[PDB]
From TrEMBL:
Reaction(s) catalysed (UniProt annotation): Hydrolysis of proteins with broad specificity similar to that of pepsin A, preferring hydrophobic residues at P1 and P1'. Clots milk and activates trypsinogen. Does not cleave 4-Gln-|-His-5, but does cleave 10-His-|-Leu-11 and 12-Val-|-Glu-13 in B chain of insulin
Organism: Rhizopus chinensis
Assigned keywords, A-Z: Aspartyl protease, Hydrolase, Protease, Signal
Protein name: rhizopuspepsin
Keyword Signal: yes
All copies of domain Peptidase A1, residue ranges: 17-273
Recorded superkingdom: Eukaryota
EC number: 3.4.23.21
GO molecular function list: aspartic-type endopeptidase activity
Enzyme class: hydrolase
Coverage span on the entire protein: 68 to 340 of 340
One BP term from GO: proteolysis
Gene behind the chain: RCAPI
Family membership noted in the UniProt record: Belongs to the peptidase A1 family.
Active-site residues, Swiss-Prot/TrEMBL: D35, D218
Length: 325
């Protein structure tokens, strides 16, 4: 693979994708979740007392470049999952790019959801303003300052499970074989530490199910989470019923459904009919969209697996285009 290219592995039904990263000297390989919704880099360590037995754990004793740090960390995510531990410093190899002296966060405790998960930790790709510890430079920050990438960008391709899954992140560049047509530039609002964009409107067929609303591009989230009114308006278009827990039950037969189209900065981007179904359990299908108590939308995987995105932390901005297939 090229310099800065990190092949991804699709877990389950497009639930989440993870890439391998090498940490320490000589170093171990860890499967990390690439999350644009957060900005901390944490991993399971041999100091953890409730971590999954299947997770690969970082061992300070086995790295000659390990450097102790007297600070502790604690993080709580939206989905209720959590973890805490101590800070440390060591080298991180990202797709051949060797970040020296990256601040890493070793877990001493983690929620059961992580212990049972397929990954060994998270690689946060959000902005520096939301790192849990003040003064910590994110991996992207260091790739830039150490001259490991000439442009402050990363191209993201998330494959659909029905197409062999897969995925690919490219730091410092992007891959045009993954998308069709021209890229559309969309300004980013990073005031809250996330990759926030404005969606002009959403339509299903000839019906405008939503006018302009704000959202954030979150690879760390599976579903397309919309504000209450917007979700209800969308659900009515597909005749889906509210499950009461923030999800919808939708017909498993999407052959008759029309795509959910997002108008962003003048161009059209969609969530194909097949992406409208997230999971099928015993003949029952859960919709690819849900709802929460937020004034903004959380644009997760469902959308990203349909559109290639080039994240530019420098401007900041993003470039989007329909995936090729």
């Amino acid at each position: 693979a090229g310099v800065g290219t990190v092949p991804m592995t699709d877990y389950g039904n497009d639930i989440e994708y993870y890439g391998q990263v090498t940490i320490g000297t000589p170093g171990k390989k860890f499967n990390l979740d690439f999350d644009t919704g957060s900005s901390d880099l944490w991993i399971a360590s041999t100091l953890c007392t409730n971590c999954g037995s299947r997770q690969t754990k970082y061992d300070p004793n086995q790295s000659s470049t390990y450097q102790a740090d007297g600070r502790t960390w604690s993080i709580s995510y939206g989905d209720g999952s959590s973890a805490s531990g101590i800070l440390a410093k060591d080298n991180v190899n990202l797709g051949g790019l060797l970040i020296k002296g990256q601040t890493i966060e070793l877990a001493k405790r983690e929620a059961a959801s992580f212990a049972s998960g397929p990954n060994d930790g998270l690689l946060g790709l959000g902005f520096d303003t939301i790192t849990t510890v003040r003064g910590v430079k994110t991996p992207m920050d260091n790739l830039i300052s150490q001259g490991l990438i000439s442009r402050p960008i990363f191209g993201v391709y998330l494959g659909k499970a029905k197409n062999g899954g897969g995925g690919e992140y490219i730091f410092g560049g992007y891959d045009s074989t993954k998308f069709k047509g021209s890229l559309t530039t969309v300004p980013i609002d990073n005031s809250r530490g996330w990759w926030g964009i404005t969606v002009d409107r959403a339509t299903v067929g000839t019906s405008t199910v939503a006018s302009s609303f704000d959202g954030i591009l979150d690879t760390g989230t599976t579903l397309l989470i919309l504000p209450n009114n917007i979700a209800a308006s969308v659900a009515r278009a597909y005749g889906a019923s509210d499950n009461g827990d923030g999800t919808y039950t939708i017909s498993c037969d999407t052959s008759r459904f029309k795509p959910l189209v997002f108008s962003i900065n003048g161009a059209s981007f969609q969530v194909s009919p097949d992406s409208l179904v997230f999971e099928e359990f015993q003949g029952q299908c859960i919709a690819g969209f849900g709802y929460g108590n937020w004034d903004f939308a959380i644009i997760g995987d469902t959308f990203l697996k349909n559109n290639y995105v080039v994240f530019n932390q420098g401007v900041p901005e993003v470039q989007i285009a329909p995936v090729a297939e």
